[PDB]
């Protein structure tokens, strides 16, 4: 197989050309496939500010105080979280699906961890790129629904 850093920065050198931010039937604005992507290939990196997980709770209450609504933090592991709320890329616009065509996965590049979205199957141009958010299940309150259109939709993102 090809070494991760070679696979990784080939993504960074071809990603902008393979994806685009359009208007979505799932929710608001989504990330869409602009050229056919083969199965298992790297689609995009969830870029942002890599912070220690202990800071997310100081971060989250601060974002409320300025009014920013949606969470844009994605968890790498027990120790780190990618905060893409203020600094990020087009991976912010990837909507959730209960029957998705992509999956998130952490890779290690020179002692630093990255969150890269891989193609679950072969994806054709025109499709909307989605992955399972895998949110922790919450209360009946703070339980926002799902509108992915999948025939086996769980009906909630939580």
């Amino acid at each position: 197989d090809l070494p991760m850093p070679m696979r990784f920065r080939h993504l960074k050198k071809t990603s902008k050309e393979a994806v685009g931010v359009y208007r979505s039937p799932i929710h608001g604005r989504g990330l869409f496939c602009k050229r056919n992507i083969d199965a298992g290939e790297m689609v995009i990196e969830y870029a942002g500010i890599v912070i220690r997980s202990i800071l997310t709770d100081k971060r989250e209450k601060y974002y409320d105080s300025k009014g920013i609504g949606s969470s844009y933090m994605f968890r790498i592991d027990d120790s780190e979280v990618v905060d893409a709320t203020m600094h990020g890329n087009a991976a912010r616009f990837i909507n959730h699906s209960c029957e998705p065509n992509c999956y998130s996965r952490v890779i290690n590049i020179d002692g630093q961890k990255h969150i890269v979205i891989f193609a679950m199957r072969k994806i054709y141009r025109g499709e909307e790129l989605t992955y399972d958010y895998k949110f922790p299940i919450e209360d009946a309150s703070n339980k926002l629904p799902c509108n992915c259109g999948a025939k086996k939709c769980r009906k909630f993102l939580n």
């Binding site: 592991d77 952490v106 958010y133």
Partner: peptide
């Protein structure tokens, strides 16, 4: 709280 996860 509400961060996406790479697995549950």
């Amino acid at each position: 709280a509400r961060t996406k996860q790479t697995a549950r």
